[PDB]
Symmetry: C4
Subunit: 169 residues, 4 copies
């Protein structure tokens, strides 16, 4: 079930707070938030690879603002370069996802999609893949803000952090 | 069970004409038309996306008629630029499809193929994917009609518009 | 079963010779020959489409004979241009495949693999794709022979026949 | 079900030393080493094919050593061209896989991944693929030795030897 989906070999039940017995009814929101934050962070980590490999959409993001796709910085100042008529489009389409299509109020996590559209019939398979989504969500949560404090402390995006050899601590 | 396949969440069963509680014996063919109109219109919306993105087949469609693939229009007049010996090859091959291979008299829908060649083996996610085929079919039937109406109103294709900025009526 | 696997809708059980009850014991090899011929002719049709689309390997087939891959004719004289030490390698590898690995004396064609490595557990779906393999094999058997006689009766490969606009029969054609 | 996983056609059970009932106790490790040596060699003959086809990573492996990916030899001396600060990075990461992530302590060879993520539930489906992993692992062990031996007995790598037409055993 859902409360043994977070455990793994090298830590087990890692509750250093002791909140699994302190707030036992609040686990199912907190699991749904940890899964939600992980799913955003894994898309954010992979997004930082693709931005900093200079893979661009080869066109104009806003011809009214004269803003090409390669006119947008890859690092922290990338979302700030998007015009406010474009951030209105992101918040409108993802209001229809987060409220109607795949509502974040649904704490189950499963939507109609499966794992690549596939329901996993074997319960030790499915719980294993559920553990990977949490663990790769946990590694990317700390990973994505290891990448944002590597830029708000240096003032240097992840491309020329590697070009100038500035990964020396 | 074909009677609850069209009914999705936000509107439920939707019958402003009341023809489910009207004639019940005409539903099996009206479902067969709605699914068939959906499948034709979904391949047409993808067709308008590929044609307006200037993805062509790199050659001559009719070297006797001196027609390159890049000479065919990408709007509603693209099908009328095809030579009459080319429209008949479309007509006679899809006579073999519509009458023999995937016979349109089969009001069931399932000819031989499934979801990428397989049954889904599971009455809840198969009914979920049957809901998606109808709902994405319904959104594309309005989508291809809206693509053709503003084609003939503006007189432009979907690449000429988005080059002039015609986004407000 | 195997006796029900070749029959589909517009013809059903189709034998003008009537050997399904004249020779009922010779059927299970004759199915395996039809399936083998179909499997061979399906790769031969896809091969002719690939050769005449000028998809070549970018190199030298035999640098000893100065023979590039693009120097090989894309028609019925393709393997007549392969050097004889090259056809020895093809015959030696498919001796290992047609006798040891996937032996052709196994008269059900069921060697190790499934349909893309999948065993189709549904018997009505497995019989459907077994019918497709036979029917696409029967269509490619007529497809490869009508491709081969159209080349030798025109003297042109399939690229040159569609370059000259020679689809119309100078001889006499028969096609769907 | 591990004593019949290497048994295939013509050889069947093959044991010229007779260790299968000289040591029926040490088979569980000895299978796990054969599977591990098979998996390492299978990713090695594929490596020699990729390197000798000049598929490189179009950049600098070590800009500190001023060394790009196309400067490394594509033969047996390619591991020596890597700087030791970089090859320390790969034994630091494969220490994490061989001890922690997929521990080679586990004599099954079985970890959370299956065959392309799927568990094969038909039992000679699964035993057919387990036989294939062993057999292609065994053929790659004899393949990666026959590549490294025939390189040093001609001095050329596999790209160099095939370009010179040095396939037939003239000097040997
Ligand atoms: C998005 C935030 C978030 C939330 C809500 C959770 C929630 C949970 N974690 Mg998870 N965890 C997270 C991120 C999160 N985690 C990250 C990023 C890692 C990698 C370090 C982990 C590593 C981890 C392990 C190994 C395990 C859990 C477990 C749990 C469950 C324990 C129940 C409980 O109440 O624990 C206490 C409550 C919390 C852990 C969440 C409270 C969030 C605090 C208040 C945030 C405080 C700010 C923080 C210090 C800032 C750090 C960022 C900075 C380093 C840059 C609970 C569902 C256990 C489990 O799932 O067992 C079934 C378990 O074994 N977590
Ligand atoms: C490490 C990568 C990874 C892995 C192994 C998984 C694994 C999974 N995802 Mg997750 N996911 C990930 C990253 C990952 N995810 C990322 C980065 C995102 C953001 C794009 C998501 C967004 C996502 C959504 C929106 C959903 C999943 C769901 C699932 C689960 C499907 C299992 C199932 O058959 O449900 C049971 C099957 C059914 C109920 C019927 C469907 C057939 C499976 C555990 C599904 C779920 O509900 O999760 C628990 C689901 O809806 N994932
Ligand atoms: C998720 C794991 C993770 C990994 C692999 C890294 C990796 C790195 N960090 Mg980061 N970091 C992380 C998370 C991570 N970080 C987190 C969670 C924090 C706290 C928010 C930091 C805070 C941090 C700072 C302040 C700095 C690094 C720096 C570095 C680089 C140091 C390289 C070295 O040789 O020493 C290296 C790329 C250094 C750097 O920025 O190099 C460019 C550096 O100055 N890290
Ligand atoms: C090919 C056209 C077509 C047909 C034959 C059907 C048939 C059906 N739909 Mg409908 N549907 C369609 C297109 C179609 N749909 C489109 C484009 C949408 C998106 C707007 C929908 C949205 C929809 C929902 C949400 C639901 C249905 C449902 C149904 C079924 C219930 C019976 C019924 O309502 O009869 C009434 C008759 C009809 C629906 C079609 C008759 C033809 C009309 C009278 C022609 C009028 C069109 C007008 C002249 C031009 C259109 C204007 C403009 C859009 C261009 C029936 C099988 C219900 C269902 O499946 O329950 C299980 C259901 O819940 N449909
Ligand atoms: C490779 C040769 C070959 C062989 C050995 C078979 C064998 C079979 N076919 Mg198949 N068939 C083939 C090719 C072949 N077929 C081709 C190319 C087509 C498409 C035209 C078909 C269309 C077909 C259908 C629709 C059906 C069969 C069926 C059968 C089975 C019925 C048993 C019987 O009495 O058949 C009769 C015996 C033979 C067919 C083998 C005799 C070979 C002849 C005498 C060789 C002479 C041909 C001649 C030179 C062709 C010249 C023209 C050509 C170059 C264009 C048997 C396994 C039936 C079935 O599977 O039911 C269980 C069935 O319904 N066949
Ligand atoms: C498998 C299906 C198939 C298809 C799609 C074709 C298609 C074709 N054939 Mg081929 N053919 C086939 C099988 C096929 N053939 C078989 C099984 C044979 C006997 C081995 C032939 C023997 C053949 C000859 C001898 C010729 C063709 C020719 C042609 C071309 C023109 C046909 C025409 O317009 O004549 C009119 C159609 C009819 C009179 C029948 C209606 C056309 C590309 C001709 C060609 O290549 O043009 C130069 C040509 O000369 N075919
Ligand atoms: C809504 C929908 O329909 O979805 C459907 C369809 C779909 C998409 C096909 C399905 C799927 C499968 C999916 C989504 C598979 C993808 C999963 C994903 C995206 C997994 C990333 C993990 C990243 C990690 C662990 C990073 C650690 C980060 C670390 C260790 C760092 O140090 C961060 C880093 O920055 C620094 C700090 C330092 C740099 O020197 C190094 C880098 C740059 C790394 C679904 C989900 O099943 C259902
Ligand atoms: C994961 C999942 O869901 O399962 C999947 C996988 C699975 C099971 C396989 C399924 C299937 C069915 C599939 C994929 C069927 C595809 C069939 C296919 C691909 C059929 C090609 C015909 C091309 C021909 C006959 C060429 C004719 C000949 C031609 C065009 C010519 O000779 C002319 C030409 O050549 C020259 C002479 C000169 C050139 O300059 C120009 C051209 C090229 C014009 C599913 C159900 O779909 C889904
Ligand atoms: C025959 C056969 O063998 O099939 C086999 C093999 C095969 C193919 C592998 C299998 C599969 C899977 C398939 C077919 C998956 C494909 C599904 C498909 C093709 C789904 C499109 C949806 C489009 C929508 C909802 C558009 C809305 C359009 C809207 C909302 C618009 O506004 C229209 C638009 O123009 C305007 C008006 C304004 C623009 O600003 C926006 C655009 C441009 C959009 C099968 C089916 O299982 C079995
Ligand atoms: C965690 C992220 C990460 C960073 C940020 C990072 C950085 C550098 N890598 Mg490392 N690396 C991995 C991860 C990371 N590496 C992983 C997962 C593996 C496979 C297990 C791996 C393998 C090698 C090899 C073979 C070499 C190598 C090198 C460098 C060097 C390049 C700059 C330079 O050399 O001027 C910089 C410091 C080369 C080298 O160290 O040359 C002296 C080299 O030859 N890496
Ligand atoms: C079975 C093999 C086969 C051959 C050998 C063949 C050959 C030619 N096709 Mg055809 N074709 C199909 C199959 C075959 N075609 C199929 C299955 C379809 C869709 C269902 C199809 C569609 C179209 C369309 C839309 C057009 C078309 C054309 C030509 C013409 C080149 C022009 C020329 O030589 O003058 C040559 C002879 C164009 C045309 O007819 O121009 C007057 C044209 O517009 N085709």
């Amino acid at each position: 079930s859902e409360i043994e989906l977070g455990v793994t070999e090298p830590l087990g039940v890692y509750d250093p707070l002791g909140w699994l017995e302190s707030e036992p009814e609040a686990f199912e929101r907190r699991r749904a938030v940890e899964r939600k934050h992980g799913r955003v962070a894994m898309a954010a980590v992979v997004g930082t690879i693709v931005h900093n490999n200079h893979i661009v959409f080869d066109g104009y993001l806003s011809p009214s603002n004269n803003l090409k796709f390669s006119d947008i910085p890859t690092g922290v100042d990338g979302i700030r370069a998007i015009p406010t008529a474009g951030l209105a489009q992101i918040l409108a389409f993802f209001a229809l996802v987060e409220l109607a299509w795949m509502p974040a109020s649904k704490y189950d996590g499963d939507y109609g999609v499966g794992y690549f559209g596939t329901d996993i019939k074997d319960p030790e398979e499915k719980a294993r893949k559920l553990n990977v989504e949490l663990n790769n969500g946990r590694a990317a949560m700390m990973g994505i803000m290891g990448n944002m404090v590597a830029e708000v402390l240096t003032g240097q995006t992840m491309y020329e952090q590697y070009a100038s050899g500035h990964i020396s601590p």
